[PDB]
Every structure is written in C-alpha cells, then in structure tokens.
Design a protein around this ligand. Structure first.
Ligand SMILES: N#Cc1cccc(-n2cc(-c3n[nH]c4cc(Cl)c(N[C@@H]5CCNC5)cc34)cn2)c1
Length: 261
C-alpha cells in the first residue's frame, strides 16, 4: 500500500565505481542525497511480474524497519533490475579482514577475544533476525561487514555457497533458522581459521555424501574444545538437536568472559 517509501528516486543517488562483481549482481559505490541536504556514502547492490516486484519491495520494507547494532539497515531501493541502497563500510568484509590480519601490513595477531567478539556480534544479529522470523539464506564471513567501531554486522539478508548449506536444505530443499545456525557454525570455523575455505580437499559436488557419512568440519589447530563444541552443535543432523541463536550467543559470551583481558 503506502509502503512506497522504500522506493527512492534515482536523482537522489549518484553511482560510482564497482567495488565487487558477483554472478547474481554487482556492488557499486554511491552517494545518497537526503532530506537534510547532506549526502552519505552508500553501497548499491543491483538485484518477471508485478507480484514478485511487490514481494521484493515489501520484504525490503521489513528490512527497512529493522534496527539492530549487529544487523545492517536498509536505506532504500531504486528501480532503475532493482538496486538496493545500504550503508557503506570502509573496513570491508570480515573474511578479507582476517586474511589481511595474517599479513604483516594489515592488523596484528587478532586475539581470541576479538575473534570471539566477532562471533558474538554475528550471533546477536542473527538472533535478532530470528526473533522476527527472518531468514538470511546467505551467511558467511564474506557477507558479514565490519563497521567503523570495529564491530561485525550481518548483511546480504533477503532475496555457490554450497559448503555453507545444511543437509536438510541440500536434500529436502527446505530452509529454516537451523540452516542459518549451520551457516553460523561454518562462519565460526572461518573466523577461527581466519579465512580458510571450508571443507578442504572435498569438492562442491561431494558435499551431501560427505555430510551423509557423518563427516563435518574438522577442528582447527589453535581452536579450543569449547569453540569446537559450539561449532559442532550447529552441524548436527537433526535441527531439533541444534541450539538456538540465543543459546549460542550466551555460550560465546560466557566463554569470552572467562578469558584474560
Ligand atoms: N575496494 C574496495 C572496498 C574497500 C572497503 C569496503 C568495500 N566495500 C564495502 C561494501 C559494502 N558496503 N556496504 C555494503 C552492504 C552490503 Cl549488503 C554488501 N554486500 C556484499 C555482497 C557480497 N559480499 C558483501 C557490501 C557492502 C562492499 N565493498 C570495498
């Protein structure tokens, strides 16, 4: 109905350079002019009936009413394939941030307190979205962004990463919150391994069988048994046995409490 406020005129937007090309869309830098007269740096992510366009912009309306420190906000949508206008993060994605942390010019040895704080951030975000019954469908360290206060916020939620998908989705083609829990365990594995590609030595087409024989992601070298238990709880065969994002968040929070400053 009156939810046309999600639509923003193209005249208020000024596109720039390509910061990254995918296959389902591209991400460009841009400036957004506002009612205040000031302009902000924004990322514009590009992308057949009038019933699916409505669903895209309505779901977009829900995302526009979301407001959580660890969840990205939806600034708007232009219609010139559609274009999704979100805030701009100078520090970039956590995956590249960790891989850079392993290099000398980048960050220093990121301690387990900072890694765990990242995981707690993503846990609070995904839990916030779970309480509102919103599904991410694409959760990875590449899709988690770092903010100006060095906090991680979830992104790319709404409407291959096979190694991030759960068995029930690989087989029954059903996607629930527990599949997002699986993706959260894989993301924790990434943050602990600081950017290692999941399931080394196993190609993308062998995933299901590999998981159908009970083989999950192995424990990293420096990882702790508590962290690997938290990850392993997410990769269980039956979603009912998997923990919820609230329980996971509290677990990681207490584990971070027990560590020296
Ligand atoms: N050179 C370079 C360089 C340097 C610093 C930062 C960036 N940079 C920022 C963004 C970005 N700002 N706000 C976003 C919102 C979403 Cl939703 C997404 N989604 C992505 C699609 C899949 N992976 C995430 C990205 C952004 C993307 N690049 C580039």
């Amino acid at each position: 109905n009156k939810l046309e406020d999600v639509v923003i005129d193209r005249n208020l937007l000024i596109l720039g350079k390509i910061l990254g090309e995918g296959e389902f869309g591209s991400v460009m830098e841009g400036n957004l002019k506002q009612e205040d007269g000031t302009s902000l740096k924004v990322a514009v992510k590009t992308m057949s009936s009038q019933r699916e366009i409505e669903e895209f912009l309505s779901e977009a309306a829900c995302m526009k009413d979301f407001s959580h420190p660890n969840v990205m906000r939806l600034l708007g949508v232009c219609i010139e394939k559609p274009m999704v206008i979100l805030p701009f993060m100078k520090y970039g994605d956590l995956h590249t941030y960790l891989l850079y942390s392993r290099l000398e010019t980048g960050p220093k040895h990121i301690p387990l307190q900072t890694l765990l704080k990242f995981m707690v951030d993503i846990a609070l975000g995904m839990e916030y979205l779970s309480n509102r019954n919103f599904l991410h469908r694409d959760l990875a360290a590449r899709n988690c962004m770092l903010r100006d206060d060095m906090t991680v916020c979830v992104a790319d939620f709404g409407l291959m990463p096979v190694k991030w998908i759960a068995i029930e989705s690989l087989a029954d083609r059903v996607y629930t919150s527990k599949s997002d829990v699986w993706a959260f365990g894989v993301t924790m594995w990434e943050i602990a391994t600081r950017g290692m590609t999941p399931y080394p030595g196993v190609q993308n087409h062998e995933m299901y069988d590999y998981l159908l024989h009970g083989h999950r992601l192995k424990q990293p070298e420096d990882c702790l048994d508590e962290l690997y238990e938290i990850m392993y709880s997410c990769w269980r065969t039956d979603p009912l046995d998997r923990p919820t994002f609230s329980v996971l968040r509290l677990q990681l929070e207490k584990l971070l409490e027990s560590l020296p400053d």
